[PDB]
Amino acid sequence: TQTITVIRGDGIGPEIMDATLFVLDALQAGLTYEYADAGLVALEKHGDLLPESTLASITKNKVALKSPLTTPVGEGFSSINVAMRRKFDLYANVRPAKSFPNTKSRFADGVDLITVRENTEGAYLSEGQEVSADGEVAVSGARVTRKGSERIVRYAFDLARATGRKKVTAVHKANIIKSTSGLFLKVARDVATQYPEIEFQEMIVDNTCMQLVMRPEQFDIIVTTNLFGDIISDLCAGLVGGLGLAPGANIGVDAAIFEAVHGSAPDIAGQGKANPCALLLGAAQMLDHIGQPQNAERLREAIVATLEAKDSLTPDLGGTGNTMGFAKAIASRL
Amino acid sequence: TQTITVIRGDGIGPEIMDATLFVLDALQAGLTYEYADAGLVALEKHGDLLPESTLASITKNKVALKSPLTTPVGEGFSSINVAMRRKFDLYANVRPAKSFPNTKSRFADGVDLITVRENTEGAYLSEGQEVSADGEVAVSGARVTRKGSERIVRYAFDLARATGRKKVTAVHKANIIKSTSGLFLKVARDVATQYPEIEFQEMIVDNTCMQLVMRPEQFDIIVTTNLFGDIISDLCAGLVGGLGLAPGANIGVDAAIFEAVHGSAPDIAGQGKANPCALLLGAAQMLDHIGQPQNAERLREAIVATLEAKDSLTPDLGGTGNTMGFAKAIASRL
């Protein structure tokens, strides 16, 4: 057995988590669920968007499955995902982009890639930002370290080995930003030598984005620095229809958090209309992470086959089914 | 009349410049040509990849049309385009992306946008780059100024007015990189108030790249900082088939240089196979810049119509025509 922390969340969160846990049970993933509060429900009932008991649950179990959360506006609330990243040193932001039939387009299918984005350093740090008093000159910084580069590239290669993928492409601008991006590329080359059967490719970031729109089928795993990974993961979402079906993970040494990328959609909450596919695919990522890749693949192919058959699809996809009915149609093809 | 500096260049350069000048004469653009050397031919014949007489020609005429150049490898030669940018303070890197029929795909057409990239500051500066002696820590910097932001955004809006376009989208990451990207966005908003009939849009860079792959038709002029503009212009090239047909300009206060983005292709030099469309479209940009937008549009629609009719196309496009024959077919539809 293994226990995971489950955050049911806000809006459509509870409905799609119910559906996801149904499919996980139908897979016989062997998991048990421990529930924790975050977001609106925590704020109302425990005084904090992110209570220490939930942090302790995640610390103990090291794996969390997280529905979307609502954070109120206008009250100075801090980003929950940022707080978790700082708390658990979640250095790998991992975003799969995969083609599915009948899910809107840029069609032609065949996209099946993962963007591994370094998420603790690079160009997105708070440190180094200042504007002069007269408002004329702004500066910002970037920091790349051997330690931070080594761990993100090792993660990418370990992911390749753990899921049966065959190529890692390191994306950089080392010709121009020689110090930081050059150190990232030097480290990536060094790490690649430790994984002889995984093809290693280097590609400049501008050419990478051109190639992603001309032939995204050529990519397998992409690994890159913080800002570049932000950009590339959202580009790739556009290749496969957008953010409505997108899973995500944020992974560190002693904790990993799996989710849907989309928000809590409170307008349709409780109506059984929400599409559970994104969170299901986040649970597939979780299964890959905890060592059940065969079940992750069973789940992804069942989703493909259910979409091909148009069996009990939710209204966002032109069907008249409901969240749980869609989940049950998926589970029937496992 | 007006005189422009013409650089015939290396490889296919002379052939495609001959064809371009033929079309410009057929347009009766009213130009006269002054020839200057750069690249291999200059190195052989005047001792320098970039002679001072060529710089003086550009200084005097303020407008240059430049074929591709070859720079030898292994001899420490400096980038010619970088030298020109520093010499003339060429702060606007301007890249049109337009759909043409029968030119390879990501098909469905309807793309017609321009990326205006700030090219003197931002995250691509040499200053601020250092690696610690032990190799563990690398740093790089970015600088954004009110002056530099004001001039690039003013250029974008002036371009809109000068060519009949209707929207400028400023692209940023001011939510995270608050100092530099935030100053860029603050300045862009301020400048936009001076152009009431040009729609102003703000968009975060990751969402922009997603939207460019889902519906590139929504964009008109995009203006952004140095690194972001590098990325977006190559993404956009991938929407319209790649770099083989791509024009470019680099523009400052007292000089402007217009070209094809592609290289000198020495393998097919002299054979009459080279496609002159990219340099022709660079000449269209030049015509927009010097105040003949009606002739730039005549040229672009003649290219569209020639491609639609499949009249004398070069082999890269599946025809059996030659460079000058393709140019003459274009000129017949002016």
XYZ file of C-alpha atoms in Angstrom:
668
model
C 0.000 0.000 0.000
C 0.929 3.688 -0.160
C -0.795 6.789 1.208
C -1.133 10.050 -0.741
C -2.397 13.442 0.402
C -5.599 14.431 -1.433
C -6.695 18.066 -1.678
C -10.291 18.248 -2.896
C -10.138 22.003 -3.466
C -12.727 24.537 -4.603
C -15.299 24.957 -7.358
C -15.302 21.902 -9.645
C -12.429 20.490 -7.564
C -14.493 18.046 -5.464
C -16.399 16.650 -8.471
C -13.325 15.982 -10.590
C -11.411 14.572 -7.611
C -14.297 12.156 -6.932
C -14.101 11.036 -10.565
C -10.299 10.712 -10.507
C -10.305 8.628 -7.321
C -12.949 6.380 -8.889
C -10.664 5.706 -11.850
C -7.639 5.164 -9.592
C -9.606 2.564 -7.611
C -10.726 0.917 -10.858
C -7.037 0.695 -11.816
C -6.309 -0.956 -8.446
C -3.422 1.463 -8.004
C -3.315 0.242 -4.400
C -3.468 3.735 -2.924
C -5.115 5.018 0.231
C -6.201 8.637 0.551
C -5.570 11.134 3.346
C -7.538 14.365 2.955
C -6.161 17.856 3.570
C -7.544 21.370 3.123
C -6.168 24.209 1.026
C -7.649 27.244 -0.664
C -11.052 28.710 0.159
C -12.214 25.783 2.318
C -9.095 26.018 4.453
C -9.375 29.813 4.793
C -12.978 29.528 5.965
C -12.484 26.579 8.302
C -8.892 26.640 9.586
C -7.904 30.305 9.261
C -5.267 29.847 6.536
C -5.225 29.221 2.786
C -2.450 26.679 3.483
C -2.571 25.173 6.983
C 0.384 23.595 8.747
C -1.526 20.308 9.059
C -1.754 20.115 5.271
C 1.958 20.875 4.940
C 2.617 18.142 7.525
C 0.423 15.699 5.598
C 2.448 16.397 2.446
C 5.736 16.149 4.370
C 4.705 12.750 5.751
C 3.281 11.235 2.568
C 5.674 13.026 0.127
C 3.000 12.792 -2.632
C -0.084 14.975 -3.099
C -2.906 15.009 -5.666
C -4.377 18.498 -5.776
C -7.652 19.785 -7.277
C -7.904 23.451 -8.337
C -8.040 26.062 -5.587
C -9.598 29.532 -5.413
C -7.550 32.410 -3.978
C -9.484 35.612 -3.183
C -8.429 38.854 -4.876
C -7.790 42.231 -3.280
C -6.657 40.926 0.119
C -2.907 40.543 -0.429
C -3.012 36.741 -0.426
C 0.200 35.028 -1.546
C 0.343 32.408 -4.303
C -0.288 28.947 -2.877
C 1.836 27.221 -5.514
C 4.748 29.574 -4.767
C 4.489 28.848 -1.042
C 4.567 25.105 -1.717
C 7.543 25.439 -4.085
C 9.531 27.359 -1.469
C 8.443 25.019 1.337
C 9.397 21.779 -0.429
C 12.127 23.005 -2.854
C 10.045 21.860 -5.838
C 12.693 22.331 -8.500
C 11.095 20.398 -11.418
C 7.976 21.855 -13.083
C 6.833 19.045 -15.401
C 4.248 19.566 -18.166
C 3.122 16.822 -20.601
C 1.704 17.831 -24.016
C -0.089 14.962 -25.789
C -2.496 14.800 -28.742
C -5.962 13.314 -28.115
C -8.699 12.731 -30.704
C -11.768 14.979 -30.860
C -10.364 17.557 -28.398
C -10.007 20.627 -30.650
C -6.961 20.892 -32.758
C -3.998 22.296 -34.397
C -4.917 18.918 -35.805
C -2.969 16.243 -37.174
C -2.044 14.430 -33.961
C 1.210 12.752 -32.975
C 2.351 15.232 -30.326
C 3.690 13.377 -27.290
C 6.286 15.410 -25.386
C 7.116 16.562 -21.853
C 8.591 19.943 -20.863
C 10.868 19.782 -17.783
C 11.353 23.331 -16.491
C 13.878 24.306 -13.800
C 11.768 26.157 -11.206
C 14.072 27.581 -8.462
C 16.649 29.826 -10.206
C 17.252 31.315 -13.666
C 15.720 34.647 -14.664
C 12.585 34.592 -12.451
C 14.133 35.328 -9.042
C 12.882 38.093 -6.763
C 16.502 38.953 -5.911
C 18.255 41.397 -8.200
C 15.197 43.489 -9.169
C 15.413 47.245 -8.685
C 14.202 50.450 -10.341
C 16.177 53.657 -9.850
C 14.488 56.422 -7.848
C 14.034 58.628 -10.928
C 12.355 55.757 -12.791
C 14.809 55.801 -15.710
C 16.706 52.515 -15.211
C 15.470 49.036 -14.226
C 17.662 45.989 -13.589
C 16.922 42.318 -13.032
C 19.212 39.334 -12.692
C 19.548 35.667 -13.446
C 21.500 33.037 -11.533
C 22.332 29.551 -12.821
C 24.269 27.117 -10.644
C 26.018 23.837 -11.252
C 23.932 22.259 -8.456
C 20.616 23.547 -9.786
C 21.403 22.633 -13.398
C 22.645 19.171 -12.420
C 19.470 18.271 -10.537
C 17.035 19.423 -13.243
C 18.888 17.604 -16.015
C 19.257 14.456 -13.911
C 15.489 14.602 -13.312
C 14.830 14.752 -17.059
C 17.027 11.735 -17.784
C 15.657 9.727 -14.848
C 12.145 10.506 -16.114
C 13.116 9.205 -19.564
C 14.388 5.956 -18.061
C 11.394 5.599 -15.721
C 8.775 5.995 -18.483
C 10.415 4.384 -21.512
C 11.151 7.585 -23.419
C 14.132 7.866 -25.724
C 15.406 11.470 -26.130
C 16.224 14.532 -23.980
C 16.670 17.893 -25.725
C 18.419 20.601 -23.691
C 17.288 24.087 -24.751
C 19.542 27.107 -24.306
C 20.886 30.441 -25.558
C 24.546 29.822 -24.731
C 25.786 31.647 -27.846
C 24.586 34.999 -26.417
C 24.032 34.537 -22.657
C 27.336 32.726 -22.251
C 27.654 32.726 -18.450
C 24.274 31.411 -17.189
C 22.807 29.552 -20.192
C 26.320 28.370 -21.077
C 26.773 26.847 -17.606
C 23.394 25.135 -17.962
C 24.445 23.625 -21.308
C 27.891 22.555 -20.024
C 26.233 20.769 -17.109
C 23.574 19.193 -19.351
C 26.274 17.730 -21.630
C 28.140 16.334 -18.617
C 25.005 14.702 -17.154
C 24.012 13.255 -20.541
C 27.179 11.161 -20.599
C 25.735 9.150 -17.635
C 22.727 7.945 -19.697
C 24.129 6.334 -22.849
C 20.879 4.903 -24.300
C 18.940 8.182 -24.006
C 19.638 10.316 -27.077
C 20.930 13.763 -26.103
C 20.143 16.777 -28.290
C 21.084 20.443 -27.840
C 18.931 23.146 -29.454
C 18.880 26.947 -29.316
C 15.631 28.310 -27.862
C 14.506 30.332 -30.896
C 15.040 27.396 -33.271
C 13.290 25.121 -30.754
C 10.142 27.258 -30.862
C 10.193 27.320 -34.679
C 10.584 23.530 -34.812
C 7.802 23.019 -32.248
C 5.345 24.665 -34.594
C 6.703 22.948 -37.752
C 7.148 19.392 -36.448
C 6.397 18.933 -32.740
C 6.494 15.185 -33.335
C 10.330 15.286 -33.243
C 10.480 16.057 -29.510
C 10.363 13.656 -26.584
C 11.560 15.245 -23.308
C 12.630 18.924 -23.367
C 14.711 20.243 -20.440
C 15.508 23.903 -19.893
C 15.882 26.842 -17.525
C 13.088 28.680 -15.727
C 11.943 31.438 -18.109
C 12.521 29.340 -21.259
C 10.490 26.487 -19.721
C 7.594 28.796 -18.838
C 7.390 29.895 -22.477
C 7.848 26.470 -24.068
C 5.273 24.690 -21.887
C 2.539 27.179 -22.816
C 3.492 27.041 -26.519
C 3.148 23.277 -26.326
C -0.254 23.547 -24.640
C -1.390 25.494 -27.699
C -0.337 22.606 -29.939
C -2.807 20.234 -28.276
C -5.827 22.499 -27.849
C -5.006 24.671 -24.856
C -5.081 24.468 -21.062
C -8.443 22.737 -20.530
C -6.926 19.243 -20.689
C -3.410 20.015 -19.366
C -1.862 18.138 -16.403
C 1.078 19.366 -14.357
C 3.462 18.305 -11.647
C 5.878 20.108 -9.340
C 8.519 17.799 -7.937
C 11.344 18.033 -5.366
C 13.506 15.556 -3.441
C 11.067 14.810 -0.600
C 7.682 15.995 -1.952
C 5.812 15.953 -5.275
C 2.477 17.608 -6.147
C 0.267 16.558 -9.082
C -2.627 18.549 -10.504
C -4.622 19.886 -13.424
C -3.322 23.178 -14.801
C -6.820 24.709 -15.124
C -8.641 26.742 -12.488
C -11.627 25.991 -10.290
C -14.407 27.153 -12.691
C -16.891 28.063 -9.912
C -19.569 28.980 -12.478
C -20.227 25.305 -13.311
C -19.396 23.920 -9.849
C -21.776 21.221 -8.643
C -23.450 20.752 -12.034
C -21.615 17.617 -13.174
C -20.366 19.328 -16.319
C -16.647 19.535 -15.523
C -14.264 17.515 -17.692
C -12.084 15.356 -15.377
C -9.492 14.505 -18.072
C -6.849 17.051 -17.018
C -6.791 15.866 -13.400
C -6.912 12.241 -14.587
C -3.777 12.948 -16.659
C -2.195 14.569 -13.603
C -2.910 11.319 -11.771
C -1.211 9.480 -14.665
C 1.873 11.668 -14.035
C 1.602 10.735 -10.357
C 1.476 7.049 -11.250
C 4.634 7.447 -13.380
C 6.317 9.195 -10.440
C 5.441 6.568 -7.822
C 6.521 3.679 -10.057
C 3.386 2.469 -11.862
C 4.095 3.463 -15.498
C 2.084 0.538 -16.863
C -1.028 1.848 -15.101
C -0.318 5.392 -16.282
C -0.239 4.081 -19.853
C -3.411 2.026 -19.326
C -5.128 5.217 -18.135
C -3.882 7.359 -21.037
C -4.891 4.785 -23.667
C -8.313 4.362 -22.031
C -8.762 8.126 -22.281
C -7.698 8.030 -25.936
C -10.090 5.158 -26.669
C -13.016 6.763 -24.824
C -12.513 9.977 -26.800
C -12.276 8.008 -30.062
C -15.563 6.221 -29.259
C -17.285 9.466 -28.090
C -18.592 7.539 -25.060
C -20.223 9.755 -22.394
C -18.194 12.895 -23.155
C -18.811 16.109 -21.194
C -20.332 19.222 -22.836
C -17.017 21.050 -23.388
C -16.333 18.302 -25.949
C -19.825 18.356 -27.473
C -21.264 15.455 -25.476
C -24.173 15.257 -23.045
C -22.422 13.214 -20.375
C -21.430 14.227 -16.858
C -18.176 14.162 -14.898
C -18.688 10.786 -13.195
C -20.250 9.223 -16.308
C -17.220 10.233 -18.391
C -14.951 8.794 -15.690
C -16.907 5.517 -15.704
C -16.682 5.298 -19.502
C -12.901 5.743 -19.173
C -12.678 3.107 -16.427
C -14.609 0.614 -18.579
C -11.772 0.640 -21.149
C -8.956 -0.077 -18.664
C 14.863 60.466 -56.468
C 16.549 58.729 -53.531
C 19.794 56.764 -53.282
C 20.151 53.517 -51.314
C 23.263 51.503 -50.494
C 23.178 48.061 -52.150
C 25.283 45.179 -50.833
C 25.338 42.355 -53.377
C 26.935 39.906 -50.948
C 28.103 36.313 -51.319
C 26.813 33.011 -52.666
C 23.306 33.448 -54.107
C 23.435 37.099 -52.999
C 24.265 38.622 -56.411
C 21.596 36.605 -58.263
C 18.764 37.454 -55.886
C 19.849 41.101 -55.679
C 19.780 41.313 -59.498
C 16.233 39.932 -59.423
C 15.129 42.269 -56.616
C 16.493 45.366 -58.360
C 14.678 44.288 -61.528
C 11.378 44.204 -59.646
C 12.091 47.535 -57.932
C 12.715 49.133 -61.340
C 9.516 47.559 -62.680
C 7.694 49.173 -59.739
C 9.258 52.534 -60.676
C 10.215 52.983 -57.035
C 12.361 55.884 -58.245
C 15.510 54.627 -56.540
C 19.139 54.822 -57.589
C 21.680 52.289 -56.364
C 25.119 52.829 -54.837
C 27.107 49.612 -54.424
C 29.183 48.697 -51.372
C 31.135 45.608 -50.321
C 30.703 43.473 -47.222
C 31.429 39.876 -46.332
C 33.764 37.612 -48.291
C 34.142 39.954 -51.282
C 35.166 42.810 -49.016
C 37.616 40.634 -47.052
C 39.304 39.491 -50.258
C 39.388 42.870 -51.982
C 39.521 45.589 -49.308
C 41.049 43.801 -46.311
C 37.966 43.926 -44.060
C 34.640 42.102 -43.798
C 33.071 45.544 -43.214
C 35.035 48.424 -44.757
C 34.800 52.032 -43.632
C 33.707 53.078 -47.133
C 30.660 50.828 -46.823
C 29.874 52.252 -43.385
C 30.232 55.743 -44.889
C 27.910 54.816 -47.760
C 25.287 53.673 -45.242
C 25.833 56.781 -43.094
C 25.300 59.013 -46.137
C 22.302 57.229 -47.650
C 20.756 56.069 -44.309
C 19.125 53.092 -46.123
C 20.755 49.825 -47.199
C 19.463 46.721 -49.003
C 21.690 43.796 -48.090
C 22.052 40.336 -49.682
C 23.316 37.426 -47.548
C 26.977 37.444 -46.553
C 29.441 34.650 -45.765
C 31.653 34.950 -42.675
C 34.556 32.470 -42.442
C 34.750 30.160 -39.423
C 37.726 29.481 -37.179
C 39.401 32.880 -37.595
C 37.798 34.865 -34.767
C 35.714 37.034 -37.095
C 33.056 39.161 -35.386
C 29.382 39.147 -36.379
C 28.749 41.664 -39.149
C 25.161 42.298 -38.067
C 26.317 42.980 -34.492
C 28.927 45.460 -35.721
C 26.293 47.296 -37.761
C 23.846 47.357 -34.831
C 26.476 48.882 -32.542
C 27.673 51.303 -35.233
C 24.232 52.688 -36.108
C 22.298 52.055 -32.837
C 19.832 49.808 -34.684
C 17.312 49.432 -31.886
C 14.336 47.953 -33.825
C 14.624 44.383 -35.167
C 11.519 44.024 -37.360
C 10.280 40.651 -38.657
C 7.116 40.194 -40.779
C 5.337 36.799 -40.760
C 2.796 36.435 -43.589
C 0.983 33.449 -45.118
C 1.537 32.763 -48.838
C -0.138 30.054 -50.935
C 1.772 26.940 -52.010
C 4.794 27.665 -49.771
C 4.628 24.738 -47.317
C 2.330 25.031 -44.414
C 1.058 24.889 -40.979
C -1.699 25.524 -43.475
C -4.766 27.364 -43.294
C -3.467 30.836 -44.145
C -4.449 34.209 -42.719
C -1.266 34.956 -40.775
C -0.236 38.577 -41.295
C 1.738 39.954 -38.345
C 4.962 41.827 -37.572
C 7.248 41.252 -34.567
C 9.015 44.430 -33.352
C 11.887 43.385 -31.080
C 13.914 45.806 -28.936
C 17.533 45.081 -29.927
C 19.909 47.148 -27.701
C 19.119 46.237 -24.059
C 17.055 43.658 -22.151
C 18.508 40.266 -21.236
C 21.028 39.863 -24.103
C 23.739 42.305 -22.987
C 27.398 41.336 -22.709
C 27.627 43.347 -19.473
C 26.728 41.540 -16.278
C 27.904 38.044 -17.308
C 30.319 36.251 -14.997
C 31.099 32.725 -13.799
C 32.767 32.234 -10.422
C 36.318 30.859 -10.445
C 35.223 27.497 -9.011
C 32.581 27.145 -11.737
C 29.670 26.760 -9.303
C 27.755 30.032 -9.821
C 26.916 31.964 -13.010
C 25.167 35.341 -13.176
C 23.757 37.408 -16.018
C 21.783 40.628 -16.021
C 19.063 42.516 -17.800
C 18.617 46.270 -18.114
C 15.448 48.012 -19.307
C 15.323 51.799 -19.559
C 12.574 54.332 -20.014
C 14.441 55.746 -23.042
C 14.949 52.364 -24.693
C 11.383 51.205 -24.034
C 9.917 54.499 -25.251
C 11.715 54.372 -28.595
C 10.835 50.748 -29.409
C 7.159 51.206 -28.574
C 6.980 54.496 -30.477
C 8.496 52.669 -33.468
C 5.782 50.004 -33.302
C 2.972 52.562 -33.229
C 4.528 54.710 -35.967
C 4.855 51.554 -38.084
C 1.155 50.819 -37.533
C 0.213 54.316 -38.684
C 2.630 54.241 -41.638
C 1.333 50.924 -43.036
C -2.378 50.990 -42.205
C -2.296 48.399 -39.429
C -4.723 48.532 -36.536
C -3.366 46.890 -33.336
C -0.172 46.822 -31.224
C 0.202 44.072 -28.609
C 2.870 44.660 -25.951
C 4.257 41.365 -24.619
C 5.713 41.113 -21.123
C 6.234 39.169 -17.892
C 5.610 42.054 -15.494
C 3.843 39.836 -12.938
C 7.144 38.051 -12.137
C 10.003 40.233 -13.449
C 8.475 43.369 -11.968
C 11.401 45.789 -12.323
C 12.530 45.425 -15.975
C 9.495 43.925 -17.754
C 7.242 46.046 -15.530
C 9.026 49.239 -16.625
C 8.655 48.153 -20.253
C 4.900 47.645 -19.779
C 4.443 50.945 -17.888
C 6.180 52.790 -20.720
C 4.207 50.911 -23.396
C 0.903 51.923 -21.760
C 2.035 55.555 -21.588
C 3.084 55.632 -25.266
C -0.146 53.928 -26.365
C -2.164 56.879 -25.085
C -0.568 59.004 -27.889
C -2.102 56.820 -30.651
C -5.848 56.681 -29.990
C -6.963 54.856 -33.174
C -4.414 52.033 -32.819
C -5.836 49.359 -30.518
C -3.479 48.634 -27.616
C -3.334 45.141 -26.111
C -1.179 43.784 -23.273
C -0.406 40.052 -23.124
C 1.829 37.881 -20.943
C 4.566 36.135 -22.941
C 3.576 32.536 -22.152
C -0.072 33.149 -23.084
C 1.102 34.994 -26.213
C 3.008 31.930 -27.426
C 0.008 29.669 -26.740
C -2.303 32.026 -28.646
C 0.151 32.292 -31.558
C -0.164 28.578 -32.156
C -3.963 28.474 -31.591
C -5.022 31.573 -33.546
C -2.150 33.613 -35.003
C -4.730 35.510 -37.044
C -5.578 37.637 -33.964
C -2.235 39.472 -33.986
C -1.224 42.540 -35.963
C 1.945 44.209 -34.601
C 3.671 42.615 -31.573
C 6.189 44.727 -29.615
C 8.453 43.351 -26.912
C 11.865 43.236 -25.258
C 15.021 41.669 -26.672
C 14.962 38.012 -25.569
C 11.156 37.702 -25.848
C 11.305 39.151 -29.384
C 14.025 36.711 -30.454
C 11.809 33.806 -29.385
C 8.530 35.127 -30.791
C 9.923 36.025 -34.228
C 11.269 32.500 -34.773
C 8.019 30.924 -33.509
C 6.167 33.050 -36.034
C 8.519 31.997 -38.835
C 7.470 28.420 -38.096
C 3.824 29.374 -38.611
C 4.451 30.370 -42.231
C 6.819 27.618 -43.351
C 10.185 28.570 -41.897
C 13.092 30.886 -42.683
C 13.408 30.345 -46.449
C 10.954 33.140 -47.286
C 11.534 35.423 -44.259
C 12.440 39.131 -44.615
C 13.992 41.254 -41.891
C 14.938 44.800 -41.063
C 17.149 46.449 -38.456
C 16.303 50.098 -37.953
C 17.747 53.048 -35.991
C 17.342 56.836 -36.049
C 19.797 57.594 -38.873
C 20.249 54.221 -40.636
C 18.073 51.244 -41.610
C 19.154 47.908 -43.133
C 16.811 45.561 -45.033
C 17.531 41.948 -45.920
C 16.472 38.332 -46.243
C 16.881 36.316 -43.052
C 18.368 33.285 -44.864
C 22.049 32.638 -45.526
C 24.132 32.716 -48.683
C 23.587 29.073 -49.813
C 26.924 28.800 -51.684
C 26.087 25.261 -52.852
C 23.553 26.555 -55.409
C 25.310 29.871 -56.122
C 25.371 30.839 -59.792
C 22.854 28.182 -60.851
C 19.742 30.364 -61.068
C 17.887 28.199 -58.568
C 17.683 30.616 -55.630
C 14.236 31.842 -54.591
C 14.312 35.684 -54.510
C 11.046 36.032 -52.532
C 12.621 36.633 -49.105
C 14.810 39.494 -50.336
C 11.887 40.849 -52.382
C 9.842 40.954 -49.154
C 12.757 42.688 -47.433
C 12.582 45.275 -50.209
C 8.837 45.587 -49.489
C 9.765 46.392 -45.858
C 12.226 48.959 -47.209
C 9.502 50.520 -49.343
C 7.234 50.784 -46.269
C 10.102 52.432 -44.375
C 10.937 55.029 -47.037
C 7.287 56.001 -47.531
C 5.986 53.901 -50.438
C 3.481 51.567 -48.709
C 1.288 51.355 -51.809
C 4.204 49.899 -53.779
C 5.058 47.522 -50.937
C 1.483 46.226 -51.078
C 1.567 45.977 -54.886
C 4.721 43.858 -54.551
C 3.297 41.583 -51.837
C 0.043 40.976 -53.735
C 1.975 40.287 -56.953
C 3.984 37.687 -55.047
C 0.768 36.177 -53.678
C -0.799 36.096 -57.149
C 2.300 34.620 -58.811
C 2.393 31.851 -56.201
C -1.342 31.210 -56.655
C -0.862 30.904 -60.439
C 2.306 28.737 -60.072
C 3.965 30.927 -62.728
C 7.722 30.297 -63.136
C 8.348 29.138 -59.555
C 11.843 28.071 -58.459
C 12.663 24.434 -57.563
C 12.396 24.880 -53.773
C 8.668 25.357 -54.445
C 8.383 22.486 -56.933
C 8.718 24.562 -60.103
C 11.272 24.496 -62.909
C 11.804 28.242 -63.156
C 14.896 30.276 -62.335
C 15.581 33.280 -60.112
C 15.183 35.977 -62.781
C 12.250 34.186 -64.442
C 10.390 34.050 -61.116
C 11.149 37.747 -60.602
C 9.815 38.570 -64.081
C 6.631 36.581 -63.427
C 6.174 38.616 -60.224
C 6.825 41.904 -62.043
C 4.229 41.020 -64.699
C 1.486 41.064 -62.028
C 2.336 44.515 -60.620
